Amino acid sequence: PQITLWKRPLVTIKIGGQLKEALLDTGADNTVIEEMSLPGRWKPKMIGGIGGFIKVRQYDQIIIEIAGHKAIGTVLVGPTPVNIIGRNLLTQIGATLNF
Amino acid sequence: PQITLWKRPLVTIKIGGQLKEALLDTGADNTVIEEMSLPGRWKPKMIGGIGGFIKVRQYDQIIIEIAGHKAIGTVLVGPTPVNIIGRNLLTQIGATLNF
Ligand SMILES: CC(C)CN(C[C@@H](O)[C@H](Cc1ccccc1)NC(=O)O[C@H]1CO[C@H]2OCC[C@H]21)S(=O)(=O)c1ccc(N)cc1
Ligand SMILES: [Cl-]
Numbered sequence: 406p407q408i409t410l411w412k413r414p415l416v417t418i419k420i421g422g423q424l425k426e427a428l429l430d431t432g433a434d435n436t437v438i439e440e441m442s443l444p445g446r447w448k449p450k451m452i453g454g455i456g457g458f459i460k461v462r463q464y465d466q467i468i469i470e471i472a473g474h475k476a477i478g479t480v481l482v483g484p485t486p487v488n489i490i491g492r493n494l495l496t497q498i499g500a501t502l503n504f
Numbered sequence: 505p506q507i508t509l510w511k512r513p514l515v516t517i518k519i520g521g522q523l524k525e526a527l528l529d530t531g532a533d534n535t536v537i538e539e540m541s542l543p544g545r546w547k548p549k550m551i552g553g554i555g556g557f558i559k560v561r562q563y564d565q566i567i568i569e570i571a572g573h574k575a576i577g578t579v580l581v582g583p584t585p586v587n588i589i590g591r592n593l594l595t596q597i598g599a600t601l602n603f
């Protein structure tokens with residue numbers, strides 16, 4: 406796909422068996438999803454942005470299907486106002502910014 | 505250019521005669537720059553990111569160079585942790601997301 410940026414670049418993802426909407430976010434180092442359960446071990450992290458920091462759970466080796474493309478990597482879970490797909494998984498689906 | 509996302513997509517911007525670095529951010533509706541002086545009047549705006557809301561100063565029709573492309577549009581000024589180029593100016597330079 407080629408996604409213009411007139412609107413928020415939202416896509417459908419599948420994570421933990423669940424279908425969700427998420428923002429493709431080149432400004433995010435890592436993927437951050439709204440509170441949900443995921444399997445396996447986790448450890449706490451703080452992530453910061455405009456407005457300050459939030460505490461998240463870091464889960465490693467999580468598979469997400471993004472717009473029909475499979476990716477694996479770290480997923481942070483916590484009180485983000487929006488589900489964000491960050492660069493750690495955008496790279497795996499071969500996403501680029503072109504102009 | 506085609507910019508991959510293994511590293512942060514940082515580019516040089518030029519505003520007010522000054523070079524700065526900024527993050528190309530498809531997850532930002534708005535362009536938000538760290539405190540600096542800009543000409544003209546400003547209007548209030550609140551923007552909401554990961555850890556909460558902040559007040560910023562909204563300046564309209566500001567001339568800004570982004571990775572060597574000219575844009576003229578809205579620039580928000582406030583305590584952002586990094587200079588961010590949002591969709592309002594990414595559309596002006598013709599950026600798309602591709603995968
Ligand atoms: C601010 C950047 C350095 C980092 N942010 C990614 C960014 O794209 C967020 C992502 C975002 C999007 C919506 C709500 C919260 C956060 N957008 C954002 O704060 O944009 C603000 C300016 O334009 C506005 O439109 C969106 C909110 C405003 S972040 O959400 O704080 C973030 C930080 C660390 C990680 N791992 C993941 C995400
Ligand atoms: Cl990862």
Ligand SMILES: [Cl-]
Nearest residue numbers: 496499508509
């Ligand atoms: Cl690559």
